[PDB]
Design a protein around this ligand. Structure first.
Ligand SMILES: Nc1ncnc2c1ncn2[C@@H]1O[C@H](COP(=O)(O)OP(=O)(O)OC[C@H]2O[C@@H](O)[C@H](O)[C@@H]2O)[C@@H](O)[C@H]1O
Ligand SMILES: [Zn+2]
Length: 260
């Protein structure tokens, strides 16, 4: 895999359709552990939610509230500025993210496929309706709840006071619209993804470990068509040798240059 910025820029100057796949590394420079005695694998499951809907909500309230505090970094801003600039030229730029933090959106990204959901979306467990939700707090019973520090315990909010569906006559319990461990990704989103990968002529893979499916396989799918894929990561990954470029470093340094 090459590290030639100049050779990358030749492709970038001419690309009609850029796909940018992002993961958690893209938000590292925005300052985005354990929450109380648990890690994500113990909370972000349907079984956890079924057993303690209040505790899973405290956890999601806390993450939503922390986000309000976080700012997109130079990486997220370079990606958003790119889309705005090319779009004045009829050139397409889309972001396919694994992240649920919505910092791409806060940076000004408009073409965004969020394959794992969003902290800022809800789904009704009764009627299935999805909606956006930016309210701090999401419900008054969660106000001040979710503190991760030692000495905090379960709020034990009765389920009828947790977020509820406003559809007429529904009244159901809402959950975060995020893909939990064990759950399938939405088939409709994956078709939109397949369409973007098939049609792109330059692909960037940014801050992802490239080992978690199905996103692990997106950039290799593109590189297999003979399209250049550029990886932007602090380290090599197991997929690195499948790609045309590798640009090592924090993406807040390397992206503003590559996408200038
Ligand atoms: N500043 C940075 N710039 C670029 N890359 C970085 C930076 N900091 C870390 N990275 C890289 O980001 C990657 C982070 O990998 P993961 O934490 O595995 O995140 P991601 O690939 O998004 O995980 C996939 C999925 O796994 C689940 O845990 C979660 O649902 C996530 O969506 C690593 O390859 C790491 O080198
Ligand atoms: Zn409902």
């Amino acid at each position: 895999p090459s590290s030639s910025m100049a050779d990358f820029r030749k492709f970038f100057a001419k690309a009609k359709h850029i796909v940018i796949i992002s993961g958690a590394g893209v938000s590292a420079e925005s300052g985005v552990g354990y929450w109380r005695k648990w890690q994500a694998q113990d909370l972000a499951t349907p079984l956890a939610f079924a057993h303690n809907p209040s505790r899973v909500w405290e956890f999601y309230h806390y993450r939503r509230e922390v986000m309000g505090s976080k700012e997109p970094n130079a990486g997220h801003r370079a990606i958003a500025e790119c889309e705005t600039r090319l779009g004045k030229q009829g050139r397409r730029v889309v972001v396919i993210t694994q992240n649920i933090d919505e910092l791409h959106r806060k940076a000004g990204t408009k073409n965004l496929l969020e394959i794992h959901g969003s902290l800022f979306k809800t789904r009704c467990t009764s009627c299935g309706v999805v909606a956006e939700n930016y309210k701090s707090p999401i419900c008054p019973a969660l106000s001040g709840k979710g503190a991760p520090e030692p000495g905090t315990q379960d709020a034990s909010i009765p389920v009828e006071k947790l977020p509820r569906c406003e559809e007429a006559g529904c009244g159901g319990l809402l959950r975060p619209h995020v893909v939990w461990f064990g759950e399938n990704l939405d088939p409709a989103i994956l078709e939109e993804v397949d369409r973007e990968l098939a049609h792109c002529d330059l692909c960037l893979v940014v801050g992802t470990s490239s080992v978690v499916y199905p996103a692990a396989m997106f950039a290799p799918q593109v590189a297999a068509r003979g399209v250049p894929v550029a990886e932007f990561n602090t380290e090599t990954t197991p997929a690195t040798n499948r790609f045309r470029f590798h640009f090592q470093g924090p993406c807040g340094t390397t992206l503003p240059e590559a996408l200038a």
